C-alpha cells in the first residue's frame, strides 16, 4: 500500500534512489531482497506509464 | 475553462484518508498511459470516469 499510494513522479525518483544505491555495493548487498521486492512491485504496478515515458536518461537508468 | 476526463484504474486502500473521502488513481483519456492521484467525495469504484477541472495538482492526504 505504501508503494501503491505514491504517484509516478515519486516512482521516478525512487528509481533514481535505486540507481544511486546500487553503486554503493555495501548497502546493496545487505538489502538485496528488499530492493528487489520494492523495485519489482513498483515497476510491475507502474508498468503501463513507465513504458510510455520517453527519456533516454530513464532508459539508461533502467539498464 | 477546458476540462478533462480521467478513468479510475485503482481505488487506493489503507491510505489514512478522512472519512467520506477516498483517494483514487486515475489515468487520462486523451493519453491513456499517464496517471495522477486524485481524491474523490462520493462512492467510487474502478473503471469509472470522473471529471477534473484541473490536472496540475497531485493529491495529498486529507486527515
Amino acid at each position: 500500500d505504501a508503494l501503491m499510494v505514491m504517484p509516478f513522479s515519486y516512482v521516478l525518483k525512487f528509481l533514481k534512489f535505486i540507481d544511486t544505491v546500487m553503486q554503493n555495493k555495501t548497502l546493496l548487498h545487505s538489502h538485496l531482497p528488499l530492493i528487489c521486492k520494492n523495485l519489482f512491485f513498483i515497476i510491475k504496478f507502474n508498468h503501463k506509464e513507465l513504458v510510455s515515458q520517453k527519456n533516454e536518461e530513464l532508459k539508461l537508468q533502467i539498464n | 475553462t477546458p476540462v478533462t476526463l480521467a478513468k479510475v484504474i485503482k481505488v487506493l486502500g489503507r491510505t489514512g484518508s478522512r472519512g467520506g473521502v477516498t483517494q483514487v488513481r486515475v489515468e487520462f483519456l486523451e493519453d491513456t498511459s499517464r496517471t495522477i492521484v486524485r481524491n474523490v467525495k462520493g462512492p467510487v469504484r474502478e473503471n469509472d470516469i470522473l471529471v477534473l477541472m484541473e490536472s496540475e495538482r497531485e493529491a495529498r492526504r486529507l486527515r
Binding site: 500500500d1 505504501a2 508503494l3 501503491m4 499510494v5 505514491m6 515519486y10 | 491510505t15 489514512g16 492526504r61
Partner: peptide, 11 residues
C-alpha cells in the same frame, strides 16, 4: 502522525 507511503514520499 504520518503513515507508510507518505513517510517514504517525504523521505
Amino acid at each position: 502522525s504520518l503513515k507508510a507511503g507518505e513517510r517514504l514520499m517525504e523521505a
